[PDB]
Coordinates of C-alpha atoms in Angstrom, one line a residue:
Chain A
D1 CA 173.5 141.0 47.9
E2 CA 171.5 143.0 45.4
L3 CA 168.4 140.9 46.2
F4 CA 168.8 141.5 49.9
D5 CA 165.9 143.8 50.2
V6 CA 163.5 141.7 48.2
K7 CA 164.3 138.5 50.1
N8 CA 164.3 140.3 53.5
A9 CA 160.9 141.8 52.8
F10 CA 159.7 138.3 51.9
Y11 CA 160.9 136.7 55.2
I12 CA 159.4 139.4 57.4
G13 CA 156.1 138.9 55.8
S14 CA 155.5 142.0 53.8
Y15 CA 154.8 140.3 50.5
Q16 CA 153.6 143.2 48.6
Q17 CA 156.7 145.1 49.4
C18 CA 158.7 142.1 48.2
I19 CA 156.8 142.1 45.0
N20 CA 157.1 145.8 44.3
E21 CA 160.8 145.8 45.0
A22 CA 161.4 142.6 43.0
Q23 CA 160.0 144.3 39.9
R24 CA 162.1 147.4 40.5
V25 CA 165.3 145.4 40.8
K26 CA 167.2 144.9 37.6
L27 CA 168.4 141.5 36.6
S28 CA 172.2 142.1 36.1
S29 CA 172.6 138.4 35.8
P30 CA 170.8 135.4 34.4
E31 CA 171.4 133.9 37.9
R32 CA 170.1 136.8 39.8
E33 CA 167.2 137.2 37.4
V34 CA 166.1 133.7 38.3
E35 CA 166.5 134.3 41.9
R36 CA 164.4 137.4 41.6
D37 CA 161.6 135.7 39.8
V38 CA 161.6 132.9 42.4
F39 CA 161.0 135.4 45.2
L40 CA 158.5 137.3 43.2
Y41 CA 156.4 134.2 42.8
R42 CA 157.1 133.1 46.3
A43 CA 155.6 136.3 47.3
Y44 CA 152.5 135.7 45.2
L45 CA 152.1 132.3 46.9
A46 CA 152.2 133.9 50.3
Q47 CA 149.4 136.2 49.0
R48 CA 147.7 133.0 47.9
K49 CA 147.5 134.2 44.3
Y50 CA 148.1 130.7 43.0
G51 CA 146.7 131.5 39.6
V52 CA 149.2 134.1 39.0
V53 CA 152.0 131.7 39.6
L54 CA 150.5 128.8 37.7
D55 CA 149.7 130.9 34.7
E56 CA 152.9 132.9 34.5
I57 CA 155.3 130.1 35.2
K58 CA 155.4 128.0 32.0
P59 CA 157.3 124.9 31.1
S60 CA 160.0 126.9 29.4
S61 CA 160.8 128.6 32.7
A62 CA 163.9 127.8 34.7
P63 CA 163.8 124.8 36.8
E64 CA 163.9 126.9 39.9
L65 CA 160.6 128.5 38.9
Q66 CA 159.4 125.0 38.0
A67 CA 159.9 124.0 41.6
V68 CA 158.0 127.0 42.8
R69 CA 155.2 126.2 40.4
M70 CA 155.2 122.7 41.6
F71 CA 154.5 124.0 45.1
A72 CA 151.9 126.3 43.7
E73 CA 149.9 123.5 42.1
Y74 CA 150.2 121.5 45.3
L75 CA 148.6 124.4 47.2
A76 CA 146.1 125.2 44.5
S77 CA 144.8 121.8 43.6
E78 CA 143.9 119.4 46.4
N79 CA 143.3 116.6 44.0
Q80 CA 146.7 117.0 42.3
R81 CA 148.6 116.6 45.6
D82 CA 148.9 112.9 45.7
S83 CA 150.0 112.8 42.1
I84 CA 152.5 115.6 42.8
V85 CA 154.0 113.9 45.8
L86 CA 154.3 110.7 43.9
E87 CA 156.2 112.5 41.2
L88 CA 158.1 114.5 43.8
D89 CA 159.2 111.2 45.3
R90 CA 160.3 109.9 42.0
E91 CA 162.2 113.0 41.2
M92 CA 163.7 113.1 44.6
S93 CA 164.9 109.5 44.4
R94 CA 165.6 109.3 40.7
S95 CA 167.9 112.3 40.5
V96 CA 170.8 113.4 42.7
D97 CA 170.8 117.2 42.1
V98 CA 171.4 119.0 45.4
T99 CA 172.6 122.2 43.9
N100 CA 169.1 123.6 43.1
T101 CA 168.4 124.9 46.6
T102 CA 165.1 126.3 45.5
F103 CA 164.1 122.9 44.5
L104 CA 165.0 121.5 47.9
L105 CA 163.0 124.2 49.7
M106 CA 160.0 123.8 47.5
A107 CA 160.1 120.1 47.7
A108 CA 160.6 120.2 51.4
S109 CA 157.7 122.5 51.6
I110 CA 155.5 120.0 49.8
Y111 CA 156.6 117.3 52.2
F112 CA 155.9 119.5 55.1
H113 CA 152.3 120.0 54.1
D114 CA 152.1 116.3 53.3
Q115 CA 153.0 115.9 56.9
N116 CA 156.0 113.8 56.0
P117 CA 158.5 115.6 58.2
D118 CA 161.1 113.0 57.6
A119 CA 161.1 113.4 53.9
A120 CA 161.1 117.2 54.1
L121 CA 163.9 117.1 56.7
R122 CA 165.7 114.5 54.6
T123 CA 165.6 116.9 51.6
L124 CA 166.6 119.9 53.6
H125 CA 169.5 117.9 55.0
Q126 CA 171.1 118.0 51.6
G127 CA 170.5 121.7 51.0
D128 CA 173.4 124.0 52.2
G129 CA 171.6 127.3 52.2
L130 CA 170.9 129.5 55.3
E131 CA 167.2 129.3 54.5
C132 CA 167.4 125.6 54.5
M133 CA 168.8 125.8 58.0
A134 CA 165.9 128.1 59.1
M135 CA 163.4 125.8 57.5
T136 CA 165.1 122.9 59.2
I137 CA 164.8 124.5 62.6
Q138 CA 161.2 125.2 62.1
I139 CA 160.5 121.6 61.3
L140 CA 162.4 120.5 64.3
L141 CA 160.3 122.8 66.5
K142 CA 157.1 121.4 65.2
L143 CA 158.6 118.0 66.0
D144 CA 159.0 119.3 69.5
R145 CA 162.6 118.5 69.6
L146 CA 163.9 121.8 70.8
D147 CA 167.3 120.3 71.4
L148 CA 167.8 119.4 67.8
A149 CA 166.5 122.8 66.9
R150 CA 169.0 124.5 69.1
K151 CA 171.9 122.8 67.3
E152 CA 170.7 124.0 63.9
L153 CA 170.2 127.5 65.2
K154 CA 173.8 127.8 66.4
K155 CA 174.8 126.2 63.2
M156 CA 173.3 129.1 61.3
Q157 CA 174.2 131.5 64.1
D158 CA 177.9 130.9 63.5
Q159 CA 177.4 131.6 59.8
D160 CA 175.4 134.7 60.1
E161 CA 174.3 136.1 63.5
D162 CA 172.9 139.3 62.1
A163 CA 170.8 137.8 59.2
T164 CA 167.2 138.5 59.7
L165 CA 166.5 134.9 58.8
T166 CA 168.8 133.9 61.7
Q167 CA 167.1 136.3 64.0
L168 CA 163.7 135.0 63.2
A169 CA 165.0 131.5 63.7
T170 CA 166.3 132.4 67.2
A171 CA 163.0 134.0 68.1
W172 CA 161.2 130.8 67.2
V173 CA 163.5 128.6 69.2
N174 CA 163.1 131.2 71.8
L175 CA 159.4 131.1 71.9
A176 CA 159.6 127.3 72.2
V177 CA 162.1 127.5 75.0
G178 CA 159.8 129.5 77.3
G179 CA 160.8 131.3 80.4
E180 CA 163.0 134.4 80.4
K181 CA 163.7 133.6 76.8
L182 CA 160.2 134.8 75.8
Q183 CA 161.3 138.4 76.4
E184 CA 164.2 137.9 74.0
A185 CA 161.8 136.6 71.3
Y186 CA 159.6 139.6 71.9
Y187 CA 162.4 142.1 71.3
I188 CA 163.6 140.5 68.1
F189 CA 160.1 140.7 66.7
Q190 CA 159.7 144.2 67.9
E191 CA 163.0 145.3 66.5
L192 CA 162.2 143.9 63.1
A193 CA 158.8 145.6 63.0
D194 CA 160.4 148.8 64.1
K195 CA 163.2 148.6 61.5
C196 CA 161.4 147.2 58.5
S197 CA 157.7 147.7 59.2
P198 CA 155.0 146.1 61.3
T199 CA 153.9 143.1 59.3
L200 CA 150.9 141.0 60.1
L201 CA 153.5 138.2 60.7
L202 CA 155.6 140.4 63.0
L203 CA 152.7 141.8 64.9
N204 CA 151.3 138.3 65.7
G205 CA 154.8 137.2 66.7
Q206 CA 155.0 140.0 69.2
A207 CA 151.5 139.2 70.5
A208 CA 152.4 135.6 70.9
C209 CA 155.4 136.6 73.0
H210 CA 153.3 138.8 75.2
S211 CA 150.6 136.2 75.5
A212 CA 153.1 133.5 76.4
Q213 CA 153.9 135.7 79.3
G214 CA 150.9 136.9 81.4
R215 CA 150.7 140.3 79.5
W216 CA 147.3 139.8 77.8
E217 CA 146.5 143.4 77.9
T218 CA 149.7 144.4 76.2
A219 CA 148.8 142.0 73.4
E220 CA 145.6 143.9 72.7
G221 CA 147.3 146.7 70.8
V222 CA 149.2 144.6 68.4
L223 CA 146.3 142.3 67.6
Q224 CA 144.0 145.3 67.3
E225 CA 146.4 146.9 64.8
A226 CA 146.8 143.7 62.9
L227 CA 143.1 143.2 62.7
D228 CA 142.6 146.6 61.4
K229 CA 144.8 145.9 58.5
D230 CA 143.5 142.5 57.5
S231 CA 140.3 141.1 58.8
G232 CA 140.1 137.4 58.2
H233 CA 143.8 137.0 59.0
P234 CA 144.0 133.6 60.4
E235 CA 146.6 134.1 63.0
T236 CA 145.1 137.3 64.2
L237 CA 141.6 135.9 64.6
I238 CA 142.8 132.9 66.5
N239 CA 144.9 135.1 68.8
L240 CA 142.0 137.3 69.3
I241 CA 139.8 134.5 70.4
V242 CA 142.3 133.4 72.9
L243 CA 143.0 137.0 74.0
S244 CA 139.3 137.8 74.3
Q245 CA 138.7 135.0 76.9
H246 CA 141.6 136.1 79.0
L247 CA 140.4 139.7 78.9
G248 CA 137.0 138.6 80.1
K249 CA 135.3 139.8 77.0
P250 CA 131.8 138.6 76.5
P251 CA 131.6 135.1 75.3
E252 CA 129.9 136.4 72.1
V253 CA 133.1 138.1 71.3
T254 CA 135.1 134.9 71.2
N255 CA 132.4 133.3 69.1
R256 CA 132.3 136.3 66.7
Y257 CA 136.0 136.0 66.0
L258 CA 135.6 132.3 65.5
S259 CA 132.8 132.7 63.0
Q260 CA 134.8 135.5 61.3
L261 CA 137.6 133.0 60.8
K262 CA 135.3 130.5 59.2
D263 CA 134.2 133.2 56.8
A264 CA 137.7 134.2 55.9
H265 CA 138.9 130.7 55.4
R266 CA 136.6 127.7 55.7
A267 CA 139.5 125.4 55.0
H268 CA 141.9 126.6 57.7
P269 CA 143.2 123.8 59.8
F270 CA 142.3 125.6 63.0
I271 CA 138.7 125.4 61.8
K272 CA 139.1 121.8 60.9
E273 CA 140.5 120.9 64.2
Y274 CA 137.7 122.7 65.9
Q275 CA 135.2 120.7 63.9
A276 CA 137.1 117.5 64.7
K277 CA 136.9 118.3 68.4
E278 CA 133.2 118.8 68.1
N279 CA 132.8 115.4 66.4
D280 CA 134.7 113.4 69.0
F281 CA 132.9 115.2 71.8
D282 CA 129.6 114.0 70.4
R283 CA 131.2 110.6 70.1
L284 CA 132.3 110.7 73.7
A285 CA 128.9 111.9 74.8
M286 CA 127.4 108.8 73.4
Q287 CA 130.0 106.7 75.2
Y288 CA 129.2 108.1 78.6
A289 CA 125.5 108.7 78.0
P290 CA 123.0 106.3 79.4
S291 CA 121.3 103.9 77.2
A292 CA 117.6 104.0 76.4
Chain B
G1 CA 159.3 114.8 71.2
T2 CA 156.5 115.3 73.6
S3 CA 153.9 117.9 72.7
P4 CA 153.2 120.6 75.1
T5 CA 149.6 119.7 75.4
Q6 CA 150.5 116.2 76.4
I7 CA 152.8 117.7 79.0
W8 CA 149.9 119.6 80.5
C9 CA 147.9 116.4 80.7
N10 CA 150.6 114.6 82.4
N11 CA 151.1 117.5 84.8
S12 CA 147.6 118.2 86.0
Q13 CA 144.6 116.4 87.4
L14 CA 142.4 119.5 86.9
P15 CA 139.8 119.0 84.2
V16 CA 140.1 122.4 82.7
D17 CA 143.8 121.8 82.0
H18 CA 142.9 118.7 80.0
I19 CA 140.2 120.6 78.1
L20 CA 142.7 123.3 77.3
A21 CA 145.0 120.6 76.1
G22 CA 142.3 119.2 73.8
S23 CA 142.2 115.9 75.6
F24 CA 138.5 115.6 75.9
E25 CA 138.4 112.0 76.7
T26 CA 140.8 112.4 79.5
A27 CA 139.0 115.5 80.7
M28 CA 135.6 113.8 80.6
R29 CA 137.0 110.9 82.6
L30 CA 138.3 113.2 85.3
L31 CA 134.9 115.0 85.5
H32 CA 133.3 111.6 85.6
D33 CA 135.4 110.3 88.4
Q34 CA 135.8 113.5 90.5
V35 CA 132.3 114.7 90.0
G36 CA 129.4 112.5 88.8
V37 CA 129.2 114.0 85.3
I38 CA 127.7 111.2 83.3
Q39 CA 125.9 113.3 80.7
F40 CA 128.4 115.5 79.0
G41 CA 126.0 116.9 76.4
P42 CA 125.4 120.1 78.3
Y43 CA 129.1 120.5 78.6
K44 CA 129.9 120.7 74.8
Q45 CA 129.8 124.5 74.6
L46 CA 132.1 124.8 77.6
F47 CA 134.6 122.4 76.2
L48 CA 134.8 124.0 72.8
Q49 CA 135.0 127.4 74.3
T50 CA 137.7 126.4 76.7
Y51 CA 139.5 124.5 74.0
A52 CA 139.6 127.5 71.6
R53 CA 141.6 129.6 74.1
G54 CA 144.2 127.0 74.7
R55 CA 146.8 127.9 72.2
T56 CA 148.1 130.9 70.3
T57 CA 149.6 130.9 66.9
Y58 CA 152.4 132.7 65.1
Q59 CA 154.1 132.1 61.7
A60 CA 157.7 131.0 61.5
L61 CA 158.1 131.2 57.8
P62 CA 155.9 132.3 55.0
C63 CA 153.9 129.8 53.0
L64 CA 154.4 127.2 55.8
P65 CA 152.0 126.0 58.3
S66 CA 151.7 128.3 61.3
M67 CA 153.2 127.5 64.6
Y68 CA 151.3 127.1 67.8
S69 CA 152.2 128.5 71.2
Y70 CA 151.1 127.1 74.5
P71 CA 151.0 129.6 77.2
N72 CA 151.7 128.3 80.7
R73 CA 150.5 129.8 83.9
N74 CA 153.8 128.9 85.4
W75 CA 155.7 130.2 82.4
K76 CA 158.7 131.4 84.3
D77 CA 159.5 128.2 86.3
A78 CA 158.0 125.7 84.0
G79 CA 160.6 124.1 81.9
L80 CA 159.8 122.0 79.0
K81 CA 158.8 119.3 81.4
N82 CA 156.7 121.1 84.0
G83 CA 154.5 123.4 82.0
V84 CA 150.8 123.8 82.9
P85 CA 148.3 125.8 81.0
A86 CA 147.5 129.4 81.8
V87 CA 144.3 130.0 83.7
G88 CA 141.6 132.0 81.8
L89 CA 138.6 131.4 84.0
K90 CA 138.5 132.5 87.6
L91 CA 136.3 132.3 90.7
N92 CA 135.7 136.0 90.6
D93 CA 134.3 135.7 87.1
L94 CA 131.8 133.2 88.3
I95 CA 130.9 135.2 91.4
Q96 CA 130.3 138.2 89.3
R97 CA 127.9 136.4 87.0
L98 CA 126.0 135.4 90.1
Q99 CA 124.7 139.0 90.5
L100 CA 123.0 138.8 87.1
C101 CA 121.3 135.6 88.4
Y102 CA 120.1 137.5 91.4
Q103 CA 118.8 140.3 89.3
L104 CA 116.8 137.9 87.2
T105 CA 115.3 136.2 90.2
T106 CA 114.1 139.5 91.6
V107 CA 112.5 140.4 88.2
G108 CA 110.7 137.0 88.2
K109 CA 112.8 135.8 85.2
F110 CA 113.2 132.5 87.1
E111 CA 113.5 130.4 84.0
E112 CA 116.3 132.5 82.7
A113 CA 117.8 132.7 86.1
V114 CA 118.0 128.9 86.3
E115 CA 120.0 128.9 83.1
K116 CA 122.5 131.4 84.4
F117 CA 122.7 129.6 87.7
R118 CA 123.2 126.3 86.1
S119 CA 125.7 127.7 83.8
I120 CA 127.8 128.9 86.7
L121 CA 127.3 125.7 88.6
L122 CA 128.6 123.7 85.7
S123 CA 131.6 126.0 85.3
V124 CA 132.8 125.6 88.8
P125 CA 134.7 122.4 88.1
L126 CA 136.5 124.2 85.3
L127 CA 138.3 126.6 87.7
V128 CA 141.8 126.4 89.0
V129 CA 141.9 127.7 92.5
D130 CA 144.9 129.1 94.2
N131 CA 144.2 128.8 97.9
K132 CA 142.3 126.6 100.3
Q133 CA 139.7 129.1 101.3
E134 CA 139.1 129.9 97.7
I135 CA 138.2 126.3 97.2
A136 CA 135.6 126.6 99.9
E137 CA 134.1 129.6 98.2
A138 CA 133.8 127.5 95.0
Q139 CA 131.9 124.9 96.9
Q140 CA 129.8 127.5 98.5
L141 CA 129.2 129.0 95.1
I142 CA 127.9 125.7 93.8
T143 CA 125.7 125.3 96.8
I144 CA 124.0 128.7 96.2
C145 CA 123.4 127.7 92.6
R146 CA 121.6 124.5 93.4
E147 CA 119.6 126.1 96.1
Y148 CA 118.2 128.6 93.7
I149 CA 117.8 126.1 90.9
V150 CA 115.8 123.7 93.0
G151 CA 113.9 126.4 94.7
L152 CA 113.0 128.3 91.5
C153 CA 112.2 125.1 89.7
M154 CA 109.9 124.0 92.5
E155 CA 108.2 127.4 92.2
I156 CA 107.6 127.2 88.5
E157 CA 105.9 123.9 89.0
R158 CA 103.8 125.0 91.9
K159 CA 102.3 127.8 89.8
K160 CA 101.5 125.2 87.1
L161 CA 99.6 122.7 89.3
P162 CA 95.9 123.1 89.4
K163 CA 94.2 125.2 92.1
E164 CA 90.8 123.5 91.9
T165 CA 90.9 120.7 94.4
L166 CA 91.2 121.3 98.1
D167 CA 93.9 118.7 98.0
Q168 CA 95.4 120.5 95.1
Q169 CA 95.4 123.6 97.1
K170 CA 97.0 121.9 100.1
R171 CA 99.7 120.7 97.7
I172 CA 100.4 124.3 96.5
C173 CA 100.7 125.7 100.0
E174 CA 103.0 122.9 100.9
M175 CA 105.3 123.6 98.0
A176 CA 105.2 127.3 98.7
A177 CA 106.2 126.5 102.3
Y178 CA 109.1 124.4 101.1
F179 CA 110.4 127.3 99.2
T180 CA 110.5 129.2 102.5
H181 CA 113.2 126.8 103.7
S182 CA 115.5 127.4 100.7
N183 CA 118.6 129.3 101.6
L184 CA 118.4 132.3 99.4
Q185 CA 119.5 135.9 100.2
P186 CA 117.1 138.0 102.2
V187 CA 115.7 139.9 99.3
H188 CA 114.5 136.7 97.7
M189 CA 113.8 135.0 100.9
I190 CA 111.4 137.8 101.8
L191 CA 109.7 137.5 98.5
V192 CA 108.9 133.8 98.9
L193 CA 107.8 134.3 102.5
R194 CA 105.4 137.0 101.3
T195 CA 103.9 134.5 98.8
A196 CA 103.6 131.7 101.3
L197 CA 101.9 134.0 103.8
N198 CA 99.1 134.8 101.3
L199 CA 98.6 131.2 100.4
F200 CA 98.4 130.1 103.9
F201 CA 96.1 132.9 104.8
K202 CA 93.5 131.9 102.3
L203 CA 94.0 128.3 103.3
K204 CA 92.8 129.6 106.7
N205 CA 95.8 127.9 108.2
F206 CA 96.3 131.0 110.3
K207 CA 98.6 129.6 112.9
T208 CA 101.2 128.6 110.3
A209 CA 100.7 131.9 108.5
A210 CA 101.5 133.8 111.6
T211 CA 104.9 132.1 111.8
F212 CA 105.7 133.0 108.3
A213 CA 104.7 136.6 108.9
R214 CA 107.0 136.9 111.9
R215 CA 109.9 135.5 110.0
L216 CA 109.2 137.9 107.1
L217 CA 109.2 140.9 109.4
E218 CA 112.5 140.0 110.9
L219 CA 114.0 140.2 107.4
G220 CA 113.1 143.8 107.3
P221 CA 111.3 144.0 104.1
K222 CA 110.4 147.4 102.6
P223 CA 108.0 149.4 104.7
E224 CA 104.9 148.9 102.6
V225 CA 105.4 145.1 102.7
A226 CA 106.1 145.2 106.4
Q227 CA 102.9 147.1 107.1
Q228 CA 100.9 144.7 105.0
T229 CA 102.5 141.8 106.8
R230 CA 101.6 143.3 110.2
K231 CA 98.0 143.6 109.0
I232 CA 97.8 140.0 108.0
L233 CA 99.6 138.9 111.2
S234 CA 97.1 140.7 113.4
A235 CA 94.2 139.0 111.5
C236 CA 95.9 135.7 112.0
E237 CA 96.1 136.3 115.7
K238 CA 92.4 136.7 116.0
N239 CA 92.0 133.1 115.0
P240 CA 95.4 131.5 115.5
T241 CA 94.6 128.0 114.2
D242 CA 95.3 125.8 111.2
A243 CA 92.3 124.5 109.5
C244 CA 94.0 121.7 107.8
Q245 CA 97.0 119.5 108.6
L246 CA 99.6 119.8 105.9
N247 CA 102.6 117.6 105.2
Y248 CA 104.9 120.4 106.3
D249 CA 107.0 120.6 109.5
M250 CA 108.5 124.0 109.9
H251 CA 110.6 122.8 112.8
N252 CA 111.8 119.5 111.4
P253 CA 114.8 119.7 109.2
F254 CA 114.1 119.2 105.5
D255 CA 115.8 118.4 102.3
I256 CA 113.8 119.1 99.2
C257 CA 113.6 116.4 96.7
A258 CA 114.8 118.1 93.6
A259 CA 112.6 115.9 91.4
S260 CA 109.5 115.3 93.5
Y261 CA 109.5 118.5 95.6
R262 CA 108.6 116.5 98.6
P263 CA 110.2 116.8 102.0
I264 CA 112.8 114.4 103.3
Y265 CA 113.1 114.8 107.0
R266 CA 116.3 114.6 108.9
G267 CA 117.7 111.0 108.9
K268 CA 115.4 109.7 106.2
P269 CA 117.3 108.1 103.4
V270 CA 118.3 110.4 100.6
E271 CA 120.4 110.2 97.4
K272 CA 122.5 113.3 96.6
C273 CA 124.0 114.7 93.5
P274 CA 127.7 114.2 93.9
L275 CA 128.3 117.7 92.4
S276 CA 125.4 119.9 93.4
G277 CA 124.5 118.5 96.7
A278 CA 120.9 118.4 95.5
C279 CA 118.9 115.9 97.3
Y280 CA 116.7 113.2 95.9
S281 CA 114.6 110.4 97.3
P282 CA 116.1 107.0 97.1
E283 CA 114.0 106.1 94.1
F284 CA 115.8 108.5 91.9
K285 CA 119.3 107.1 92.5
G286 CA 121.1 106.3 89.3
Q287 CA 119.1 108.9 87.4
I288 CA 120.4 112.1 85.8
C289 CA 120.2 115.0 88.2
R290 CA 117.5 117.5 87.4
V291 CA 119.4 120.4 88.8
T292 CA 122.8 119.6 87.4
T293 CA 121.4 117.8 84.3
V294 CA 124.9 116.4 83.7
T295 CA 125.3 114.3 86.9
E296 CA 124.2 110.9 88.2
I297 CA 122.4 111.0 91.5
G298 CA 123.7 107.7 93.0
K299 CA 127.3 108.0 91.9
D300 CA 130.0 108.0 94.5
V301 CA 132.8 110.4 93.5
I302 CA 136.3 111.5 94.5
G303 CA 135.0 115.0 94.8
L304 CA 135.6 118.3 93.0
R305 CA 139.3 118.9 92.3
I306 CA 139.7 122.5 91.5
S307 CA 143.2 123.0 93.0
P308 CA 146.4 121.1 93.1
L309 CA 146.5 121.8 96.8
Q310 CA 143.9 119.0 97.1
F311 CA 146.4 116.5 96.0
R312 CA 148.8 115.6 98.9
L313 CA 151.9 113.4 99.1

């Protein structure tokens, strides 16, 4: 696979690396060229550079790109989403085409955000690709059906044990499993970071593994390193808040990270949940509180 | 399937566990039954703070929603079924904070001290305690907090009341005397005794003053204070006598009404805060505890449930 580096960089989480390499790579095939562009834009989406994707991908572009763009608009425009899903539903039902894997992944992604796990899973079921399998496992884990997840993992495991995508998948299942497994997950994350490069994604994964186990202090270094690279990184800040409390840092510290998160991303679901909790708490207070 | 947070809720009675889970309503209920906590409002910061720490996050795939991890204190043994949230707050932490409270009391920062004390007191129910004795310490820790809170709060008021009437003065001395009873550490206990002695001296209730002086000396205050105390004591001896009768019985056991700051002798009916142990006169029952601020005075409760040891089968 010529694209191997580009894709691999993408999965690990080093988007810029993916973008840089994608450009360097030569097409050598109308097919490959399309795949390259797909990843290139996918990388931009990870970066959250929606405008880049929306502007550059134009109607004349290949359908694979179109799917990517579809996802991009979904992420970019909140208003557009219901309309997009409706169309997605229509396209999904009124059209058989399984072959376009990219379409399935993008479509599944939209459903995933839509929180229609069934639809996303339904779509993924059709897709053959290894990535489809990985995405499938991830959805199952969110579903909290580890058992189903395990089956898919082995499914991919038989196909390609060594693939990084497979390894990441195993780590995920692993993290979910708990127990001795956690160490296994830790090593895979560590190995990837060592081989490829510490990515924010990889660092947090390692931290999560350590945190799952008692080792709060060990976690400090990875988070600290991650924070240094990108302040405002959502996973990092959240982990820091959790880590800070275990460490016994001053309560202000936990608060500071939390506030920092709001600055970086007002929208972030973690923030929304936090707000939601505040609301019901007030609601509950009234319930218990004495009347006057 | 079943979410890990839910598993935690099913698994543990402890309130902190539920808060970590995010099950506020459940947690509040537990606090309501186990301890009196009617008024949750002072709790809000604790809940959110506790809640924030509950789960970690990592990203499975790019451009997808991030995954959440739920750490378990019994990670090794806990299967999918028997997980329980990691700790995060411990008894030692609370105990350590206590020193700061002591420091503030000495400085005279009483109002701030009350806040720190109350903060700790409220936090006690949050703890997960490993062993039986450790449970006792927690209870003891709570007791210390209320003792200071009621005592300090009484003191703040006493200063506020007017000096002018003789009756007003008798009131002040009485309150000062009540403080004497509070079970504080010797550094503080000495300080209060020192104050009471002066008030009683001016009151010309020398006989009572002498007793305070003797108690103070036993504590072993610094030498300057001790010398001063001896001086006052000798003066008192010249005319051992109390000019006025006060509503204070050094010998009879007391219980200070947290609200009224009036003595409740031995057997006399009292209503107590389920959580703090603070005492109130029967009138108060059903009202929000001044000390705790969260609890209901009258409420009957299961009792604090910090550790799983408490549950038996």
